[PDB]
Amino acid sequence: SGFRKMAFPSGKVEGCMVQVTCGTTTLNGLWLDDVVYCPRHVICTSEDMLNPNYEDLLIRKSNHNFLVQAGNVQLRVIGHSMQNCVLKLKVDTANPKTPKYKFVRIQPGQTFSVLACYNGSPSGVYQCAMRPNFTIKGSFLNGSCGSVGFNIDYDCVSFCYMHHMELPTGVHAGTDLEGNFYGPFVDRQTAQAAGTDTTITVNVLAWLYAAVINGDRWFLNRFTTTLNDFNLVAMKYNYEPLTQDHVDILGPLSAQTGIAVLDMCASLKELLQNGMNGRTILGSALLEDEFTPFDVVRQCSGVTFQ
Amino acid sequence: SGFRKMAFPSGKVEGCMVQVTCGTTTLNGLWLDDVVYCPRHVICTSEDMLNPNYEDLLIRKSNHNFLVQAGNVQLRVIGHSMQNCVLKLKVDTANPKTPKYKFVRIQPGQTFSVLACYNGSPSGVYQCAMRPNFTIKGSFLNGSCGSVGFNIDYDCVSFCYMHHMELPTGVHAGTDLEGNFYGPFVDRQTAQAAGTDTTITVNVLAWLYAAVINGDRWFLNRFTTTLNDFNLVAMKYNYEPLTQDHVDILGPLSAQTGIAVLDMCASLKELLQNGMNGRTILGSALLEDEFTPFDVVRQCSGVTFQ
Ligand SMILES: *CC(=O)N1CCN(Cc2cccc3ccccc23)CC1
Ligand SMILES: *CC(=O)N1CCN(Cc2cccc3ccccc23)CC1
């Protein structure tokens, strides 16, 4: 028993992190096979960031201008190209520690682990959700860019995020591993506004099911409700609307606890209107939305990986 | 910027986890050099747990009764001994992935990372604190015993915890790597009561300093206070008393924020008496005590490891 915000084990990713230096800037890169991936703003100076023309700046760089280091081993760049907002550096040595991997573009509300790195070296690991406004609320300092987010399925590492920037508001924005930003952001030093950050309703329900599995049952009430009636209340509190796909995804948790989704929705409705009255659920005084239904099943059943 | 409950990277520990089987029971073991460490209750049946005589049960076991597996590689046990509540299985092959390591017995209030494992395979990683009553509030299912807690300093893994049991109350108890339980618990299926679980005051202060570093300053008030006056209020709310050693440890955070410890204590005092009024600090509606002052400095300065 117990419930924790659990990250994936990071060992398979630790062996892929390298340090990338171009001119004076030093960021993290991700070394898979014989290619290193890193944010293209590694080629910028502090002055270029206000309005960078990446194509023009990249012309002034040659293969020998990029210094890639893996601990103390040194890689020779024999080819470079820009793909959207990431640089692909072809090196001479394939990474012997390359795991079974895949590049995936996640959807808002999905969760992943971040391996925060500085100078190519791992600093720590934590779990987070992609917010509905395509930001993440991470922990990143200068030099952490190029750190990656990932999931592990079976023996395969699915890379889904590379960190690029901190917004003036303190939240974080980045790309998939093909270099397409999540959200409308651009890699330029200019005022950018994220949208409204709504609560991931299907995740909150999954976490309420986790609470019941672990013995916190006080919020379970007599009422029930309808999907339309619930969504009308949810949207007033900036909760994402619930759809039938969401109800389908919660089916196995319903089956294990004997509590129907709409009944659970009626408990949530009352929690939104009346608050929590100074009580807690799974050790929290706020409704938590960084666990997907799959995260709950995974943790409550003990799924392991390679 | 940002602040997250961050675990250490787990790769160095993942390569040390093995599966240990004796008779019908299968737990996790920790393979360092040519020794495997595991909970001694691996030699018990479900019936033995009510009142086990470990010395007598261990007599009925020989070296070939223990099956240790590392993925698909198999270790041959050539010597076994009991040290307090852990078994030390001498094997024929030294672990090639043995890191620089150390065994350490931590003090209540210190934090560490747990690598939750099942059948010798990693499932996830999370950070937790040793509570003042020597329990931890983990996430553990059947088969997770022998999972270990650890810290990383420089290039050295400091093992400080091995999981042994779940109390009837849902909290977790275990030993150091010499097999001495933390707290008064015994590895036997009997009703055991943990003491009162108090809040780790010095950690709460460190986290308030983290909040100020990250821009949450609303709780900062006009008043100040004295150590004696603060402790008188803290003990009413089951907070650990603050000592001068605690004030000394917080010195660097005081220097970086320009806020004196006693001034920060006066803010906490008002938070304890008046509550939080539906506001949050670093995304939480509760005062958080699972960050040590060192965790805050580490995260807010970007310390890396091997
Ligand atoms: C994450 C990291 O290591 N850095 C982030 C900031 N900086 C370059 C950079 C990249 C994208 C946008 C942006 C906007 C303003 C200032 C700097 C920016 C390098 C280090
Ligand atoms: C953690 C784990 O894998 N297990 C814990 C429970 N069990 C054996 C065991 C060990 C210590 C105390 C105790 C008390 C009651 C029941 C079982 C107990 C094996 C699996």
XYZ file of C-alpha atoms and ligand atoms in Angstrom:
652
model
C 0.000 0.000 0.000
C 0.854 3.689 -0.167
C 0.842 6.053 -3.125
C 3.746 8.172 -4.361
C 4.474 10.390 -7.351
C 6.810 7.825 -8.907
C 9.246 8.446 -11.754
C 10.550 5.770 -14.112
C 14.022 4.366 -13.384
C 16.453 6.517 -15.292
C 19.464 4.264 -15.923
C 18.681 3.618 -19.593
C 18.566 7.379 -20.237
C 21.600 8.308 -18.120
C 23.871 6.484 -20.563
C 22.576 8.625 -23.440
C 23.270 12.085 -22.024
C 26.218 14.033 -23.434
C 27.487 17.592 -23.223
C 27.274 19.743 -26.351
C 29.359 22.875 -26.834
C 29.263 25.227 -29.805
C 31.208 28.415 -29.382
C 30.629 29.515 -25.792
C 27.276 27.826 -25.075
C 27.173 24.395 -23.396
C 23.945 22.366 -23.265
C 22.901 18.750 -22.889
C 22.497 16.451 -25.832
C 20.913 13.039 -26.314
C 23.209 10.461 -27.957
C 21.338 7.659 -29.761
C 23.116 5.390 -32.239
C 25.511 7.748 -34.101
C 23.398 10.951 -33.801
C 23.351 13.612 -31.084
C 20.168 15.651 -30.618
C 20.179 19.056 -28.940
C 18.310 22.405 -28.952
C 19.292 24.499 -31.942
C 19.741 27.562 -29.752
C 23.092 26.086 -28.706
C 24.464 28.048 -31.697
C 23.243 31.400 -30.311
C 24.901 34.088 -28.234
C 23.028 36.077 -25.608
C 22.598 38.851 -28.182
C 21.196 36.574 -30.916
C 18.293 35.366 -28.741
C 16.184 38.509 -29.172
C 15.683 37.796 -32.879
C 17.683 34.815 -34.184
C 17.841 33.815 -37.852
C 18.842 30.210 -37.232
C 19.477 29.372 -40.890
C 21.918 32.284 -41.193
C 23.626 31.519 -37.860
C 23.959 27.834 -38.736
C 25.731 28.709 -42.010
C 28.564 30.241 -39.975
C 29.161 26.877 -38.237
C 31.156 23.888 -39.533
C 31.392 20.309 -38.260
C 34.524 21.108 -36.217
C 32.792 23.989 -34.400
C 30.710 21.529 -32.328
C 32.355 19.832 -29.335
C 30.424 16.818 -28.015
C 31.673 15.100 -24.851
C 30.404 11.964 -23.086
C 32.065 11.982 -19.682
C 35.652 12.021 -20.914
C 35.142 10.257 -24.254
C 35.039 12.730 -27.156
C 32.888 12.431 -30.266
C 33.878 13.714 -33.697
C 31.090 15.496 -35.597
C 31.050 14.364 -39.230
C 27.701 15.876 -40.260
C 25.186 18.395 -38.909
C 21.657 19.326 -39.887
C 18.748 21.279 -38.467
C 15.369 19.577 -38.146
C 12.770 22.097 -36.980
C 14.044 23.314 -33.605
C 16.624 20.544 -32.889
C 20.109 20.051 -34.285
C 21.075 16.560 -35.440
C 24.841 16.076 -35.064
C 26.149 12.978 -36.837
C 29.133 11.583 -34.916
C 31.681 8.885 -35.727
C 30.952 6.502 -32.813
C 27.612 4.814 -32.208
C 26.558 4.916 -28.560
C 27.199 1.379 -27.206
C 24.569 2.048 -24.517
C 21.798 2.925 -26.982
C 18.603 1.306 -25.656
C 15.577 0.173 -27.583
C 13.991 3.569 -28.149
C 11.208 5.399 -29.929
C 10.276 9.041 -30.499
C 6.676 9.875 -29.558
C 4.650 13.081 -29.463
C 2.459 12.958 -26.365
C -0.938 14.541 -25.839
C -1.809 16.991 -23.052
C -2.639 15.205 -19.837
C -0.095 12.461 -20.410
C 2.686 12.101 -17.860
C 6.373 11.379 -18.236
C 9.633 11.437 -16.277
C 12.251 14.179 -16.694
C 15.943 13.503 -16.195
C 17.293 16.928 -15.261
C 20.907 17.223 -16.401
C 23.684 19.834 -16.328
C 26.860 19.629 -18.442
C 25.826 16.177 -19.676
C 25.537 14.833 -16.103
C 22.314 13.682 -14.396
C 21.082 15.739 -11.455
C 17.736 14.157 -10.575
C 14.519 12.652 -11.848
C 10.871 13.631 -11.325
C 7.438 12.974 -12.837
C 5.260 15.608 -14.447
C 2.286 16.075 -16.719
C 1.974 17.906 -19.987
C -0.498 20.655 -19.072
C -3.535 21.284 -21.301
C -1.804 24.532 -22.395
C 1.300 22.552 -23.551
C 3.611 23.840 -20.784
C 5.123 21.772 -18.025
C 5.762 22.849 -14.437
C 9.297 21.557 -14.078
C 12.465 22.326 -12.149
C 15.101 23.691 -14.545
C 18.051 26.064 -14.143
C 20.410 27.550 -16.718
C 22.277 24.746 -18.432
C 19.455 22.192 -18.095
C 18.253 22.684 -21.677
C 18.437 19.534 -23.748
C 17.347 17.485 -20.742
C 14.724 14.981 -21.906
C 11.391 13.573 -20.766
C 10.579 9.923 -21.305
C 8.426 6.890 -20.572
C 9.414 3.228 -20.374
C 7.209 0.518 -21.852
C 8.502 -3.037 -21.523
C 12.148 -2.585 -22.562
C 11.636 0.433 -24.852
C 12.394 4.042 -23.886
C 9.881 6.450 -25.453
C 11.395 9.928 -25.655
C 8.681 12.566 -25.745
C 10.171 15.890 -24.547
C 13.346 17.964 -24.807
C 13.609 21.097 -22.676
C 14.190 24.397 -24.533
C 13.068 27.415 -22.569
C 11.644 29.027 -19.490
C 8.801 31.439 -20.080
C 8.852 34.800 -18.256
C 6.053 33.300 -16.133
C 8.273 30.509 -14.740
C 6.812 27.547 -16.612
C 8.638 25.437 -19.158
C 8.320 24.786 -22.874
C 10.028 22.363 -25.193
C 9.778 20.141 -28.225
C 9.318 16.549 -29.197
C 12.420 14.757 -30.470
C 11.619 15.764 -34.042
C 11.986 19.346 -32.833
C 8.358 20.472 -33.053
C 7.395 22.626 -30.091
C 4.537 21.568 -27.912
C 2.157 24.512 -28.011
C 2.492 27.780 -29.919
C 5.898 28.729 -28.544
C 9.002 29.751 -30.492
C 12.673 29.530 -29.468
C 13.202 33.266 -29.282
C 13.589 35.710 -26.377
C 10.243 37.459 -26.652
C 7.133 37.780 -24.509
C 5.027 34.662 -25.059
C 1.775 33.898 -23.257
C 0.551 30.422 -22.449
C -3.167 29.828 -22.453
C -5.426 29.078 -19.533
C -4.131 26.105 -17.522
C -7.113 23.812 -16.836
C -7.264 20.766 -14.541
C -7.008 17.306 -16.153
C -10.306 15.834 -15.002
C -9.706 12.223 -16.060
C -6.473 12.238 -14.049
C -8.219 13.556 -10.926
C -10.713 10.691 -11.171
C -7.907 8.153 -11.529
C -6.324 9.551 -8.367
C -9.610 9.337 -6.470
C -9.717 5.660 -7.463
C -6.151 5.330 -6.161
C -7.308 6.857 -2.859
C -10.145 4.341 -2.515
C -7.770 1.459 -3.257
C -5.587 2.761 -0.405
C -8.331 3.313 2.175
C -9.321 7.008 1.901
C -13.079 6.666 1.349
C -14.504 9.722 3.163
C -15.240 11.693 -0.037
C -17.537 8.891 -1.279
C -21.085 10.265 -1.189
C -24.679 9.133 -1.744
C -25.443 11.099 -4.905
C -24.863 10.304 -8.533
C -24.867 12.485 -11.620
C -24.851 12.584 -15.406
C -21.987 13.365 -17.759
C -23.710 16.558 -18.949
C -24.556 17.666 -15.420
C -20.991 16.993 -14.275
C -19.340 18.809 -17.201
C -21.541 21.839 -16.507
C -20.045 22.043 -13.015
C -16.515 21.116 -14.113
C -16.269 23.913 -16.681
C -17.167 26.503 -14.037
C -14.055 25.456 -12.058
C -11.802 25.270 -15.177
C -11.806 21.484 -15.318
C -11.419 19.770 -18.661
C -14.713 18.302 -19.909
C -15.081 14.555 -19.503
C -15.859 12.468 -22.595
C -16.952 8.880 -23.153
C -13.379 7.943 -24.093
C -12.387 9.096 -20.597
C -15.144 6.951 -19.072
C -13.925 3.968 -21.102
C -10.307 4.452 -19.978
C -11.423 4.404 -16.313
C -13.268 1.076 -16.725
C -10.661 -1.214 -15.124
C -10.399 1.020 -12.048
C -14.188 0.957 -11.789
C -14.122 -2.850 -11.964
C -11.475 -3.212 -9.253
C -13.158 -0.873 -6.748
C -16.822 -1.597 -7.497
C -17.506 2.135 -7.913
C -19.060 3.399 -11.120
C -17.405 6.284 -12.959
C -20.484 8.511 -12.737
C -20.730 7.808 -9.006
C -17.088 8.846 -8.669
C -17.927 11.929 -10.772
C -20.665 12.836 -8.277
C -18.129 12.700 -5.434
C -15.813 15.006 -7.385
C -18.678 17.430 -8.094
C -19.324 17.763 -4.360
C -15.604 18.183 -3.707
C -15.531 21.026 -6.254
C -18.551 22.834 -4.756
C -17.892 22.309 -1.032
C -14.086 22.042 -0.977
C -12.245 19.618 1.277
C -12.996 21.215 4.688
C -9.405 20.956 5.877
C -9.256 17.211 5.211
C -6.793 15.467 2.891
C -6.792 12.691 0.283
C -3.677 10.520 -0.108
C -1.796 13.108 1.941
C -2.837 16.107 -0.185
C -5.095 19.092 0.486
C -5.548 19.739 -3.257
C -7.077 17.606 -5.967
C -4.140 16.049 -7.831
C -4.081 15.673 -11.620
C -0.585 14.356 -12.458
C -1.515 10.646 -12.416
C -3.069 9.105 -15.511
C -5.359 6.082 -15.163
C -2.438 4.012 -16.452
C -0.084 5.423 -13.795
C -2.552 4.316 -11.112
C -2.915 0.774 -12.493
C 0.865 0.557 -12.939
C 1.638 1.604 -9.361
C -1.208 -0.324 -7.704
C -0.266 -3.572 -9.540
C 3.554 -3.412 -9.518
C 4.457 -3.250 -13.213
C 8.208 -3.618 -13.819
C 10.517 -2.828 -16.742
C 13.834 -3.969 -18.221
C 13.129 28.063 -11.677
C 10.476 25.683 -10.387
C 10.606 23.233 -7.503
C 9.927 19.495 -7.655
C 10.220 16.535 -5.302
C 13.278 15.177 -7.110
C 14.762 11.704 -6.709
C 18.381 10.799 -7.421
C 19.121 9.140 -10.776
C 18.834 5.429 -10.206
C 21.082 3.857 -12.855
C 23.926 3.004 -10.470
C 21.487 1.101 -8.233
C 19.535 -0.615 -11.025
C 22.604 -2.675 -11.913
C 22.797 -4.014 -8.347
C 19.281 -5.421 -8.004
C 18.847 -9.198 -8.162
C 16.065 -11.656 -7.429
C 16.458 -13.939 -4.414
C 14.486 -17.153 -4.001
C 14.631 -19.540 -1.060
C 12.021 -22.244 -1.068
C 8.827 -20.601 -2.305
C 9.499 -16.961 -1.350
C 11.004 -14.550 -3.904
C 12.320 -11.130 -2.842
C 14.773 -8.539 -4.098
C 18.414 -8.594 -3.173
C 21.247 -6.091 -3.470
C 24.369 -7.454 -5.206
C 27.587 -5.632 -4.242
C 30.995 -7.135 -5.000
C 30.521 -10.890 -4.335
C 27.807 -10.581 -1.624
C 24.019 -10.454 -1.950
C 22.033 -8.734 0.808
C 18.360 -9.475 1.414
C 15.748 -9.565 4.221
C 16.147 -12.663 6.350
C 12.419 -13.340 6.206
C 13.001 -14.726 2.706
C 13.517 -18.060 4.520
C 10.021 -17.981 6.076
C 6.702 -19.462 5.034
C 3.406 -17.691 5.633
C 2.957 -19.826 8.755
C 6.403 -19.035 10.215
C 5.780 -15.263 10.237
C 3.586 -15.277 13.353
C 6.517 -16.331 15.544
C 9.712 -17.128 13.609
C 12.863 -18.534 15.214
C 15.236 -17.385 12.489
C 18.278 -19.221 13.853
C 16.371 -22.521 13.823
C 14.857 -21.897 10.370
C 18.235 -20.912 8.931
C 19.776 -24.196 10.138
C 17.413 -26.069 7.811
C 18.859 -24.191 4.798
C 22.054 -24.978 2.857
C 23.950 -22.949 0.254
C 22.149 -24.717 -2.619
C 18.709 -23.835 -1.210
C 19.138 -20.173 -2.252
C 18.549 -19.244 -5.903
C 19.894 -15.803 -6.857
C 19.193 -14.484 -10.363
C 20.368 -11.280 -12.070
C 18.212 -10.938 -15.164
C 19.137 -14.259 -16.746
C 22.625 -14.661 -15.265
C 22.633 -17.065 -12.303
C 24.790 -16.770 -9.197
C 26.091 -19.719 -7.194
C 25.856 -19.303 -3.410
C 29.075 -20.484 -1.760
C 28.455 -19.108 1.746
C 25.559 -17.691 3.771
C 25.339 -15.895 7.087
C 22.809 -13.893 9.059
C 23.747 -10.415 10.261
C 20.966 -9.023 12.450
C 17.903 -8.938 10.191
C 19.648 -9.314 6.777
C 21.079 -12.396 5.107
C 24.518 -12.110 3.514
C 24.802 -14.571 0.612
C 28.361 -15.013 -0.649
C 28.297 -15.741 -4.392
C 30.979 -16.848 -6.844
C 30.860 -13.849 -9.229
C 31.604 -10.272 -8.214
C 29.109 -7.793 -9.649
C 30.939 -6.052 -12.544
C 28.571 -3.086 -12.115
C 29.390 -2.544 -8.433
C 29.619 1.232 -7.909
C 31.602 3.124 -5.332
C 29.327 2.536 -2.357
C 28.978 2.985 1.376
C 26.547 1.789 4.045
C 25.148 4.590 6.220
C 22.569 4.734 8.998
C 20.553 7.916 8.524
C 18.866 10.032 11.169
C 15.157 10.913 11.238
C 14.386 13.864 9.022
C 16.948 12.893 6.410
C 15.682 12.152 2.915
C 16.631 9.502 0.400
C 15.453 7.930 -2.858
C 13.756 4.518 -3.015
C 14.102 2.256 -6.032
C 10.954 0.139 -5.845
C 11.626 -3.273 -7.379
C 9.717 -6.516 -7.993
C 11.384 -9.832 -8.899
C 14.760 -8.085 -9.126
C 13.443 -5.572 -11.698
C 13.069 -1.804 -11.160
C 9.543 -0.401 -11.135
C 10.027 3.262 -10.230
C 11.859 5.774 -8.092
C 10.621 8.350 -5.568
C 11.955 10.533 -2.747
C 10.912 10.242 0.872
C 11.908 11.213 4.377
C 12.632 9.082 7.389
C 9.846 10.158 9.753
C 10.689 11.125 13.351
C 9.011 7.838 14.412
C 11.397 5.825 12.144
C 8.720 4.804 9.605
C 8.558 5.889 6.004
C 5.435 6.619 3.965
C 6.333 4.687 0.841
C 4.630 2.852 -2.002
C 5.266 -0.892 -1.646
C 3.331 -4.003 -2.682
C 3.979 -7.676 -1.982
C 7.300 -8.646 -3.504
C 8.898 -5.202 -3.077
C 10.803 -6.205 0.066
C 14.546 -5.912 -0.312
C 14.098 -2.745 -2.360
C 16.642 -0.183 -1.146
C 16.827 3.515 -0.322
C 19.911 5.513 -1.200
C 21.642 8.853 -1.670
C 24.333 9.838 -4.163
C 27.256 12.026 -3.133
C 29.793 12.796 -5.851
C 30.282 9.336 -7.390
C 29.461 7.288 -4.269
C 26.128 5.552 -3.628
C 25.213 5.637 0.077
C 22.771 2.834 0.857
C 20.713 3.667 3.923
C 17.477 1.613 3.815
C 16.208 -1.848 2.885
C 12.458 -2.444 2.930
C 11.188 -5.243 5.217
C 7.573 -4.816 6.207
C 4.287 -3.002 6.065
C 2.720 -2.207 9.406
C -1.013 -2.889 9.879
C -1.375 0.910 9.728
C -0.070 1.137 6.136
C 3.332 2.688 6.797
C 6.666 1.045 6.125
C 9.563 -0.181 8.233
C 12.981 -1.486 7.354
C 16.628 -1.734 8.267
C 19.964 -0.235 7.445
C 22.284 -2.386 5.337
C 23.809 -3.921 8.457
C 20.322 -5.233 9.194
C 19.456 -3.090 12.217
C 15.855 -1.924 12.102
C 15.119 1.748 12.164
C 12.848 2.187 15.165
C 11.624 -0.435 17.626
C 10.156 -2.794 15.042
C 10.781 -6.527 14.665
C 10.439 -8.728 11.565
C 7.507 -10.716 12.878
C 3.781 -10.732 12.055
C 2.490 -9.108 15.222
C 0.721 -5.879 16.123
C 3.353 -3.145 16.344
C 2.621 0.517 17.027
C 4.680 3.386 15.698
C 4.974 6.470 17.838
C 3.547 9.900 17.217
C 4.550 11.203 13.773
C 5.715 14.817 14.220
C 6.526 17.383 11.513
C 10.210 17.978 10.668
C 10.436 21.684 11.433
C 13.889 22.347 9.964
C 12.708 20.840 6.672
C 9.602 23.050 6.575
C 11.828 26.110 6.988
C 14.105 24.951 4.175
C 11.057 24.619 1.927
C 9.845 28.105 2.836
C 13.275 29.364 1.756
C 12.830 27.424 -1.493
C 9.476 29.179 -1.981
C 11.039 32.621 -1.531
C 13.808 31.761 -3.997
C 11.059 30.872 -6.496
C 8.846 33.926 -5.984
C 6.179 32.889 -3.429
C 6.637 35.632 -0.819
C 3.079 36.201 0.476
C 3.634 34.361 3.788
C 6.469 36.772 4.695
C 5.216 38.890 7.599
C 6.282 41.860 9.730
C 6.814 40.063 13.036
C 9.802 38.264 14.439
C 10.155 35.828 17.308
C 12.543 33.981 19.595
C 13.603 30.346 19.500
C 11.882 29.658 22.839
C 8.710 31.472 21.815
C 8.628 29.611 18.498
C 9.225 26.161 20.023
C 6.381 26.800 22.475
C 4.019 27.226 19.524
C 5.588 24.445 17.441
C 5.147 21.789 20.131
C 1.424 22.560 20.368
C 1.064 21.605 16.672
C 3.329 18.504 16.973
C 6.293 20.139 15.268
C 9.784 19.032 16.193
C 11.568 21.598 18.383
C 14.130 23.749 16.609
C 17.691 23.813 17.965
C 20.728 25.986 17.310
C 22.203 23.252 15.101
C 19.097 23.636 12.924
C 19.614 27.410 12.797
C 23.249 26.863 11.799
C 22.305 24.434 9.007
C 19.910 27.035 7.531
C 22.623 29.732 7.402
C 23.430 29.539 3.672
C 19.747 29.793 2.729
C 19.464 32.818 5.010
C 22.468 34.392 3.271
C 21.093 33.829 -0.234
C 17.618 35.242 0.479
C 18.497 37.991 2.964
C 15.908 36.640 5.422
C 16.969 35.734 8.937
C 16.048 32.316 10.318
C 14.082 33.757 13.242
C 12.178 36.024 10.852
C 11.328 32.956 8.774
C 10.321 31.215 12.028
C 7.894 34.065 12.755
C 6.256 33.548 9.351
C 5.875 29.835 10.095
C 4.376 30.585 13.526
C 1.667 32.692 11.885
C 1.082 29.991 9.276
C 0.586 27.456 12.088
C -1.888 29.645 14.017
C -3.884 31.142 11.126
C -3.555 28.402 8.492
C -3.103 29.158 4.808
C -6.566 30.625 4.025
C -6.988 28.580 0.860
C -3.709 29.831 -0.613
C -0.772 27.648 -1.660
C 3.030 27.659 -1.424
C 5.063 26.084 -4.245
C 1.848 24.466 -5.461
C 0.912 22.906 -2.102
C -1.884 23.597 0.379
C 0.039 21.880 3.205
C 3.355 22.714 4.801
C 5.873 20.303 3.262
C 8.625 18.635 5.298
C 10.319 16.177 2.899
C 13.065 18.566 1.724
C 16.180 18.971 3.845
C 18.149 22.228 3.698
C 20.682 20.331 1.585
C 17.984 19.170 -0.857
C 16.973 22.807 -1.371
C 20.542 24.017 -1.989
C 21.158 21.037 -4.285
C 18.070 21.674 -6.420
C 18.334 25.480 -6.466
C 22.031 25.354 -7.523
C 22.059 22.395 -9.945
C 24.378 19.890 -8.260
C 25.211 16.924 -10.513
C 26.611 13.436 -9.904
C 28.580 10.732 -11.721
C 17.521 25.760 -20.489
C 18.885 26.392 -20.643
O 19.903 25.724 -20.409
N 18.904 27.677 -21.088
C 17.698 28.460 -21.398
C 17.967 29.923 -21.733
N 19.045 30.132 -22.711
C 18.692 30.327 -24.137
C 17.237 30.541 -24.558
C 16.528 29.612 -25.305
C 15.179 29.795 -25.711
C 14.521 30.947 -25.369
C 15.196 31.942 -24.606
C 14.536 33.136 -24.236
C 15.195 34.086 -23.493
C 16.543 33.908 -23.105
C 17.217 32.765 -23.445
C 16.567 31.751 -24.200
C 20.242 29.299 -22.484
C 20.193 28.347 -21.291
C 7.666 -6.467 1.291
C 7.345 -7.858 0.795
O 7.743 -8.219 -0.322
N 6.660 -8.658 1.655
C 6.217 -8.242 2.994
C 5.337 -9.260 3.710
N 5.860 -10.634 3.689
C 6.625 -11.128 4.858
C 6.675 -10.321 6.156
C 7.834 -9.719 6.622
C 7.901 -8.970 7.827
C 6.777 -8.826 8.597
C 5.556 -9.423 8.175
C 4.381 -9.283 8.949
C 3.206 -9.857 8.528
C 3.145 -10.616 7.337
C 4.263 -10.775 6.560
C 5.495 -10.185 6.951
C 6.395 -11.061 2.382
C 6.340 -10.033 1.254
